[PDB]
Ligand binder design. Sequence first.
Ligand SMILES: NC(=O)c1ccc[n+]([C@@H]2O[C@H](COP(=O)([O-])OP(=O)(O)OC[C@H]3O[C@@H](n4cnc5c(N)ncnc54)[C@H](OP(=O)(O)O)[C@@H]3O)[C@@H](O)[C@H]2O)c1
Ligand SMILES: [Cl-]
Ligand SMILES: [Cl-]
Ligand SMILES: [Cl-]
Ligand SMILES: [Cl-]
Ligand SMILES: [Cl-]
Ligand SMILES: [Cl-]
Ligand SMILES: [Cl-]
Ligand SMILES: [Cl-]
Ligand SMILES: [K+]
Ligand SMILES: [K+]
Ligand SMILES: [K+]
Ligand SMILES: [K+]
Ligand SMILES: [K+]
Length: 324
Amino acid sequence: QQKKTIAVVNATGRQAASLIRVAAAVGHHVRAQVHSLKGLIAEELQAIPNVTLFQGPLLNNVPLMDTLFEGAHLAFINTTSQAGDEIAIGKDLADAAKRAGTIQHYIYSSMPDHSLYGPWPAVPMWAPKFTVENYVRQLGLPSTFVYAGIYNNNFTSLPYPLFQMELMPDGTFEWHAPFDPDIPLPWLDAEHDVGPALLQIFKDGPQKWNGHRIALTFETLSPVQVCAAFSRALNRRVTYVQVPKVEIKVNIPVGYREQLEAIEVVFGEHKAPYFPLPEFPGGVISQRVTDEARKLWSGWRDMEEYAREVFPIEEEANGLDWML
Ligand SMILES: NC(=O)c1ccc[n+]([C@@H]2O[C@H](COP(=O)([O-])OP(=O)(O)OC[C@H]3O[C@@H](n4cnc5c(N)ncnc54)[C@H](OP(=O)(O)O)[C@@H]3O)[C@@H](O)[C@H]2O)c1
Ligand SMILES: [Cl-]
Ligand SMILES: [Cl-]
Ligand SMILES: [Cl-]
Ligand SMILES: [Cl-]
Ligand SMILES: [Cl-]
Ligand SMILES: [Cl-]
Ligand SMILES: [Cl-]
Ligand SMILES: [Cl-]
Ligand SMILES: [K+]
Ligand SMILES: [K+]
Ligand SMILES: [K+]
Ligand SMILES: [K+]
Ligand SMILES: [K+]
């Protein structure tokens, strides 16, 4: 079984980059689109022999999409709002993959539209992906949809919104967010675990996974449990503080601000599930949201491992020195 060529977009993003590194390591050639060739990650991927980068915007650039899928047999597509009209781009990519005629398994990274499951607003950077998912489903090629849990590495002590592990004057850390302190949230070590899981889906094949939604989360932890993991990892006091509104301490694009306001309503006010879809006596065993992901990849890393082994390095690389 010669490893098939995988087409991917937004290659410098955490999800795609995770897949590209391990896919290339096991023999897959990769055709990857990047908005630009500069940057540490783009440079890193360009140096991988099995990888070929195609620089250019996706917005209104079907020709680049046709080039990307040329000769590819598999695809992993994860769009971002930074590239622009996510729905238009997601549909254009799906169409280009079908037109290539060689795509045997198309994995699209989707997210929920909360407004379909309760008296909740749609989270703006998530709902559009669900529209693309519906469109992909009606295309004549096998497709699978993965839903990413919250990234372990969203955490930083820099003053960025929602996931700031704030370093206090006394050396302790505090994480302030709207999430209920005790409701478990789905987490994901994006860099280490997205790739391996995706590869297993491709290995399993389209017959087993066509039409399926898979939650890419390997651990559920309430905010209090997250802080306890950081505390054990760093041997420091780390405490969770539930706040009504997201503390926005830096300037952000308006689209992100609307995303955060939706999060305050969805999670702060309504305590709705992160994955609101329905699917997410003796011997009767109900499936946990982490079941399929763990079956796909047993080598996943938890929050405590991230906090102890990676967080200190990412923090130092960002110039912080609490770990010095
Ligand atoms: N973080 C979470 O907890 C979480 C959970 C579930 C789903 N998601 C979804 O994940 C998606 C993001 O994917 P990701 O995590 O793999 O990416 P990511 O790591 O957040 O990286 C974002 C990327 O977009 C690039 N970029 C910057 N400006 C751009 C522009 N104007 N046009 C095109 N690309 C541009 C950046 O490249 P350079 O910096 O190299 O230029 C970077 O590679 C989002 O749609 C988000 O909703 C996130
Ligand atoms: Cl293969
Ligand atoms: Cl190639
Ligand atoms: Cl990119
Ligand atoms: Cl047909
Ligand atoms: Cl701060
Ligand atoms: Cl706490
Ligand atoms: Cl700012
Ligand atoms: Cl959930
Ligand atoms: K290369
Ligand atoms: K509704
Ligand atoms: K399909
Ligand atoms: K069709
Ligand atoms: K996703």
